[PDB]
Amino acid sequence: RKPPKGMFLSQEDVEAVSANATAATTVLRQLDMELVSVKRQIQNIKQTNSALKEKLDGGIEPYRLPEVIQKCNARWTTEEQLLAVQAIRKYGRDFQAISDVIGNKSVVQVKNFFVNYRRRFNIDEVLQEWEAEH
Amino acid sequence: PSGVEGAAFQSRLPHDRMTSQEAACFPDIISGPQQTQKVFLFIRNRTLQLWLDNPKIQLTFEATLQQLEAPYNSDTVLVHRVHSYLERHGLINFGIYKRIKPLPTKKTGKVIIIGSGVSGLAAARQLQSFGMDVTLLEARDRVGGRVATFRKGNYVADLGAMVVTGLGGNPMAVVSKQVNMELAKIKQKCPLYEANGQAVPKEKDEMVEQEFNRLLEATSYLSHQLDFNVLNNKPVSLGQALEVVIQLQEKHVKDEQIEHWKKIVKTQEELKELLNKMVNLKEKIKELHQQYKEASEVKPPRDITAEFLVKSKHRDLTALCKEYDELAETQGKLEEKLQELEANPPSDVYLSSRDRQILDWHFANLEFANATPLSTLSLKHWDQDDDFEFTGSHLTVRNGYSCVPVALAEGLDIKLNTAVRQVRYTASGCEVIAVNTRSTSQTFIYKCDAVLCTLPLGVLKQQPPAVQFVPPLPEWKTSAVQRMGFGNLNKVVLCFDRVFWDPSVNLFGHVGSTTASRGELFLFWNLYKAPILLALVAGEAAGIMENISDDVIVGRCLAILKGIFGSSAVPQPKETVVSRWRADPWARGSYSYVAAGSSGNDYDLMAQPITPGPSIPGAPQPIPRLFFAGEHTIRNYPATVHGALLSGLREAGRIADQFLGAMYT
Ligand SMILES: Cc1cc2c(cc1C)N1[C@H](O)C[C@H](c3ccccc3)[C@]13C(=O)NC(=O)N=C3N2C[C@H](O)[C@H](O)[C@H](O)COP(=O)(O)OP(=O)(O)OC[C@H]1O[C@@H](n2cnc3c(N)ncnc32)[C@H](O)[C@@H]1O
């Protein structure tokens, strides 16, 4: 009830090949043509990808900046608070971004700032301002 | 199988069960208690064993009862009934053996047998043994018909039958003990040589053969499971099925090549999208770097808005740099994924030009066995007789197969050079009109009670007919004759003075250039004592080569051999013989095959006797008068010598039963 292991036979394929005296040749020819159609399509995209790879020569090395690793301070200086306010205005709720902008404040210290200086720094207004422009 | 069970197996009978034939003669036993059936089976099996252990002497009823132990030897009538049944059906006391009870001088009934081939000879010996007057009419100047052996000096080579197929269950095993048959095993090692003359390496030989078997197995699936047996109102042939399977395999090779590319283009397009993303990201990174630089130019001290920038741009540039690295990481994965696919293509072709040529040899070999092009074979029934094959290795008659018929002809009334022209059968008897083949004007009339026709199917197929039947044969008989296939195959005997071939090799093949000529001298046999090489012509080539002269045929044979063993190693043959079975008026082909549109039932129809109408209107239903034997009349063993032999035994029993009565029933 099974063809030999590796052999391929199906009711659909048998009917399609024995439909007429030239169906067998027609089926094989249409598959042969479809192979050339895909082979030339490969070299076409291979040429397209090769050109795009040249536009990436050098990578992003001349645009790489060194990492300014500084000690994480617990106290907030006037300047640091002002950096936060503008970060909240530009990033919204992305605590990670805000923290990276300041440099010396952890992700938790940022969240604490949101609650501690909520009223005084009109964070409610700043947050809705960000929503109006994303 | 051993003991009494071996005897049943050697007689093609089940040891633990009664056959339909036995049921008909012993209805009282098969319908009765199980115990009685076992008593019958034992007596039957033992009697067979006694005859088989010593087939050179007649096994009489008295001798059988004498060698039986209690309680089986108590019922003397049951033993007699079993013994007579076996004798009448030729299961015991057949062939050539020493007669203990000399043939009674007074004969009963007259029988004319047409043809003195194996089927005709077997039946004649039996009919004579039963006490009937038997005369054989043979057209040729010799006996054996399709068992023809070329003999000149020490050169011996068969032009007709040559192979005995296994001894387990074969009636030829008994014959080989009665006749001086020099049987030799056939070494199955067959090296192949391409058109150029160079051998085919083991790797290719095994790969193609495995594929050949896989292709045949596939056609079976296509027949039994997919029911692809009729196409355009025509029965499907083995060739058509094979063609379809090959084409579908070529199709798969191509549905896999396409798939493998299509996987490349999909990944290739994934690279396109990723590269476009990377290029545009590199642009934004270039832009932000310039903005950061301009912002950094604003020297400290500076207001917090200027300080927000720079730091804000630093963060944005760092974030976008991470994105590029992750995208470049994906580029490396896709790039190598494409290198893997490009290094792992599927198969380019199903079978190369070289592969197809070697495959064509295997098809030619199959065309040889069936003595017909594969496009004529019935897909559904070409292998209907496979379940009845004998166990054991195939052998060859080293002293020529003709020893069998010549031996079976001893003591028989055979009229050679007598070509039957007309067969007349009526309610009161039969008359056969025959002529002298040397001088056609001389006419002979033979009157008889019954006629056993063993004419080859090819002769029966003749149009206009060579042998006229009066009255004409019924439509059911003629339609079978027309449906049944009668193939052809020829042999070229090459006699040399020295051995230039491999002596340890029994046979080697020649791979033809095209599919059309695949069966043209594709196989060479080395089985005889004297330095003889036998070439085979099969398939579509068989019929065509018959119109080609001997000289040209021998030339091609030498050309092939020269290309294999060396141009100087092959000397001009001292003797050459070429068979032409199709042109032969007394054969009109080699043997029957299951043609498309036919079935195993046609063989049964060929075996059915003909009963003439009454001479006087209102007279009782007459006796069957015309009987048929021959290879084409035995469904389970056609196209063989054993089959012919067995068909003769069948008719002899049927005729005797009809004209001498059956006391055992
Ligand atoms: C021609 C031929 C035949 C074979 C073979 C090769 C050739 C070239 N070989 C091949 O090598 C392969 C084939 C084979 C091999 C392995 C397994 C199965 C088969 C083989 C073979 O070796 N082994 C075998 O068992 N049978 C073969 N055979 C087939 C057997 O030889 C036959 O099946 C068997 O011998 C036929 O016996 P038969 O009694 O049924 O038919 P004939 O022997 O033709 O008898 C008819 C007689 O009527 C006569 N006749 C014709 N018209 C007449 C007329 N008008 N009046 C009077 N007589 C007439 C004919 O002259 C002839 O004597």
Side-chain angles (χ1 to χ4, degrees):
Chain A
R1 207 170 73 261
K2 275 186 188 288
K5 291 174 179 179
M7 211 106 289
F8 289 87
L9 303 151
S10 52
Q11 192 69 232
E12 192 178 54
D13 287 6
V14 177
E15 285 170 324
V17 165
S18 61
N20 51 283
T22 53
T25 317
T26 309
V27 164
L28 292 171
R29 192 175 298 175
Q30 291 207 32
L31 286 181
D32 264 334
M33 286 179 66
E34 207 203 327
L35 185 66
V36 179
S37 186
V38 171
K39 273 190 176 180
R40 72 163 164 256
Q41 194 188 349
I42 285 156
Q43 280 191 35
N44 195 293
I45 305 172
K46 194 182 178 180
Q47 186 81 47
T48 302
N49 285 330
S50 188
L52 291 172
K53 274 170 71 183
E54 276 204 26
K55 288 194 180 185
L56 289 174
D57 192 302
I60 57 158
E61 254 48 50
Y63 315 102
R64 229 147 208 148
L65 298 175
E67 191 58 52
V68 194
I69 300 161
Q70 59 183 322
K71 303 288 180 183
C72 192
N73 201 308
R75 296 207 178 191
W76 288 74
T77 59
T78 314
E79 286 77 10
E80 281 154 358
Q81 294 178 337
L82 293 158
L83 281 170
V85 164
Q86 296 175 78
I88 300 169
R89 172 73 168 87
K90 188 192 170 67
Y91 303 104
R93 284 173 181 90
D94 187 344
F95 310 108
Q96 177 62 0
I98 298 162
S99 169
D100 292 328
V101 162
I102 304 172
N104 72 336
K105 295 289 174 289
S106 65
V107 188
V108 73
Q109 284 172 332
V110 169
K111 282 221 298 171
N112 276 247
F113 177 80
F114 271 85
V115 184
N116 280 294
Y117 291 87
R118 201 202 189 189
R119 290 185 179 179
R120 287 167 297 177
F121 284 135
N122 301 113
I123 306 181
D124 284 327
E125 266 191 349
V126 175
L127 281 165
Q128 72 181 15
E129 270 191 314
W130 177 80
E131 289 170 339
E133 64 174 63
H134 291 69
Chain B
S2 68
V4 289
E5 294 177 48
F9 173 82
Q10 195 54 55
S11 297
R12 298 153 308 281
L13 302 164
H15 70 97
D16 54 12
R17 201 175 64 258
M18 285 182 69
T19 67
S20 175
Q21 190 158 253
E22 288 166 328
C25 307
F26 305 85
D28 54 306
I29 289 152
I30 194 163
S31 53
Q34 284 275 59
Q35 185 56 29
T36 305
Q37 286 171 40
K38 282 185 176 187
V39 178
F40 165 85
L41 292 169
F42 186 82
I43 294 166
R44 173 255 261 168
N45 292 334
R46 182 83 174 113
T47 311
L48 288 170
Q49 187 183 36
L50 290 172
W51 157 252
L52 290 171
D53 284 11
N54 194 15
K56 273 174 275 194
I57 54 150
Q58 184 195 358
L59 177 67
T60 62
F61 162 67
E62 282 91 325
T64 310
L65 196 71
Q66 214 91 25
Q67 299 201 62
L68 274 163
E69 277 270 69
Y72 310 104
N73 79 317
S74 61
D75 203 338
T76 63
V77 289
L78 177 51
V79 172
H80 203 129
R81 282 175 69 207
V82 170
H83 181 268
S84 294
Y85 163 82
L86 295 164
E87 186 163 58
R88 184 56 55 94
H89 288 78
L91 283 163
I92 65 158
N93 296 333
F94 69 92
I96 309 142
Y97 52 90
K98 275 204 189 184
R99 204 168 302 277
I100 293 170
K101 289 164 181 171
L103 289 158
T105 183
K106 291 185 287 162
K107 285 154 162 57
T108 309
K110 177 66 201 190
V111 191
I112 279 291
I113 303 185
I114 306 169
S116 71
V118 171
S119 71
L121 288 157
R125 283 207 136 250
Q126 292 286 112
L127 286 171
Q128 180 171 100
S129 164
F130 300 152
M132 301 198 86
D133 191 347
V134 171
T135 297
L136 293 85
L137 309 182
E138 177 52 50
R140 299 180 190 272
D141 59 350
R142 60 165 182 86
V143 296
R146 276 172 285 174
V147 169
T149 308
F150 167 63
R151 294 187 192 274
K152 205 189 187 197
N154 290 334
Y155 295 112
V156 167
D158 286 294
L159 288 158
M162 136 191 77
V163 171
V164 174
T165 73
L167 297 193
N170 199 336
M172 290 311 281
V174 166
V175 171
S176 68
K177 287 191 176 193
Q178 304 179 335
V179 191
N180 201 321
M181 286 188 81
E182 197 157 339
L183 298 163
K185 284 207 195 83
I186 292 168
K187 293 183 185 178
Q188 290 287 321
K189 203 179 88 161
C190 185
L192 310 178
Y193 298 95
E194 291 163 52
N196 65 356
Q198 283 184 340
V200 178
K202 273 180 174 169
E203 280 206 31
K204 280 289 172 183
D205 193 22
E206 286 174 344
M207 276 167 74
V208 180
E209 193 178 2
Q210 184 192 120
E211 196 59 24
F212 165 71
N213 290 314
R214 280 165 58 80
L215 282 165
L216 287 179
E217 202 161 67
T219 52
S220 181
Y221 172 89
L222 180 66
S223 179
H224 299 102
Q225 312 300 317
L226 303 178
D227 202 45
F228 183 72
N229 297 294
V230 171
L231 190 75
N232 292 42
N233 290 286
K234 297 172 196 294
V236 177
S237 72
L238 185 62
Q240 280 175 352
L242 278 161
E243 200 182 354
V244 164
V245 177
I246 286 167
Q247 285 163 339
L248 260 55
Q249 297 317 287
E250 287 179 50
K251 177 181 174 290
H252 175 264
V253 163
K254 291 188 195 297
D255 273 13
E256 285 282 296
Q257 274 179 314
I258 285 176
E259 185 171 286
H260 174 256
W261 301 106
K262 275 198 172 187
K263 283 186 185 193
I264 290 182
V265 301
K266 189 186 168 183
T267 307
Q268 205 75 249
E269 275 197 288
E270 269 197 57
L271 189 74
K272 194 189 174 191
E273 270 184 67
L274 201 86
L275 287 177
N276 269 316
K277 196 157 286 161
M278 281 177 71
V279 160
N280 296 330
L281 190 57
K282 187 199 166 189
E283 290 286 353
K284 295 200 201 78
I285 284 170
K286 182 182 191 287
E287 183 145 25
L288 265 183
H289 180 82
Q290 185 59 34
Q291 280 167 18
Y292 168 85
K293 218 83 197 182
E294 282 164 38
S296 306
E297 294 181 43
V298 191
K299 307 306 171 195
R302 48 201 172 184
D303 49 76
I304 207 69
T305 34
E307 191 79 51
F308 172 65
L309 206 69
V310 179
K311 278 201 167 83
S312 164
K313 296 289 175 183
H314 197 309
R315 191 229 81 85
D316 294 350
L317 187 45
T318 304
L320 286 188
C321 273
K322 254 88 173 183
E323 282 199 58
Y324 187 87
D325 293 347
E326 298 207 38
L327 261 51
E329 204 161 317
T330 312
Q331 192 203 344
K333 280 181 186 173
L334 294 172
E335 218 151 45
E336 70 180 55
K337 186 189 174 185
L338 283 168
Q339 283 175 39
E340 190 203 322
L341 295 160
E342 279 161 5
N344 293 293
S347 303
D348 195 298
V349 286
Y350 167 55
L351 291 172
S352 66
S353 296
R354 205 166 161 275
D355 295 319
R356 180 58 214 246
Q357 279 166 346
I358 302 161
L359 183 71
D360 271 332
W361 185 93
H362 280 98
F363 288 143
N365 198 230
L366 188 64
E367 277 171 337
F368 147 64
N370 291 281
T372 196
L374 304 181
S375 52
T376 62
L377 286 168
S378 159
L379 167 67
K380 194 186 268 185
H381 313 296
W382 78 279
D383 58 342
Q384 59 93 19
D385 67 328
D386 285 21
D387 298 336
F388 307 91
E389 277 176 31
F390 304 135
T391 72
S393 56
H394 292 205
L395 320 159
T396 47
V397 201
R398 221 155 188 269
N399 60 314
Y401 219 143
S402 79
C403 61
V404 173
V406 170
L408 288 169
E410 164 149 13
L412 285 171
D413 186 28
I414 301 156
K415 308 292 183 209
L416 299 165
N417 307 292
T418 312
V420 166
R421 288 270 195 260
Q422 189 170 110
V423 178
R424 294 191 154 254
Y425 55 100
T426 53
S428 71
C430 300
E431 75 177 303
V432 176
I433 301 99
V435 303
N436 189 319
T437 63
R438 297 155 291 175
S439 51
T440 61
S441 37
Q442 181 159 30
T443 307
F444 296 101
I445 309 293
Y446 298 95
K447 302 272 166 63
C448 52
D449 296 287
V451 175
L452 176 51
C453 172
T454 74
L455 295 164
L457 178 63
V459 171
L460 293 171
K461 283 181 168 289
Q462 254 183 286
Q463 216 63 57
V467 177
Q468 187 193 339
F469 287 96
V470 181
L473 296 185
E475 284 194 40
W476 62 261
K477 178 70 77 168
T478 57
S479 284
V481 168
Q482 292 162 20
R483 282 196 301 273
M484 283 200 59
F486 200 64
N488 183 34
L489 84 80
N490 288 301
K491 301 173 174 181
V492 187
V493 176
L494 301 160
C495 299
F496 299 102
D497 56 17
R498 70 197 189 200
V499 175
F500 57 85
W501 53 89
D502 194 326
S504 71
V505 172
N506 274 189
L507 57 338
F508 60 88
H510 161 254
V511 185
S513 291
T514 54
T515 298
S517 66
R518 68 187 178 191
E520 179 173 292
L521 313 161
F522 83 101
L523 190 46
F524 290 78
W525 293 95
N526 167 41
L527 321 151
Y528 298 99
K529 320 176 189 179
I532 291 162
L533 277 189
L534 202 145
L536 292 176
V537 187
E540 299 286 24
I544 305 166
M545 298 263 292
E546 280 200 15
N547 308 128
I548 297 172
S549 63
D550 299 340
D551 295 43
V552 177
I553 294 171
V554 179
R556 302 218 185 122
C557 287
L558 300 173
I560 289 157
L561 294 166
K562 283 183 196 298
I564 298 162
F565 306 106
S567 195
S568 55
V570 192
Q572 279 296 318
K574 293 278 151 62
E575 299 287 320
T576 48
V577 189
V578 169
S579 74
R580 294 180 164 87
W581 291 101
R582 188 68 81 190
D584 186 334
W586 319 121
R588 296 263 177 244
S590 67
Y591 46 90
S592 82
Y593 66 88
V594 188
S598 174
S599 79
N601 176 250
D602 283 336
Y603 289 85
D604 279 334
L605 288 172
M606 286 306 301
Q608 284 311 290
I610 309 292
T611 304
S615 283
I616 302 161
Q621 166 83 279
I623 302 95
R625 298 280 186 188
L626 184 54
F627 302 82
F628 297 91
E631 150 263 331
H632 56 289
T633 66
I634 187 152
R635 163 176 215 159
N636 294 355
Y637 317 90
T640 59
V641 173
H642 52 262
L645 185 287
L646 290 166
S647 72
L649 300 186
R650 181 199 59 213
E651 294 320 301
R654 161 147 63 196
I655 286 161
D657 273 356
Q658 177 58 239
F659 297 91
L660 305 179
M663 291 281 188
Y664 58 94
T665 57

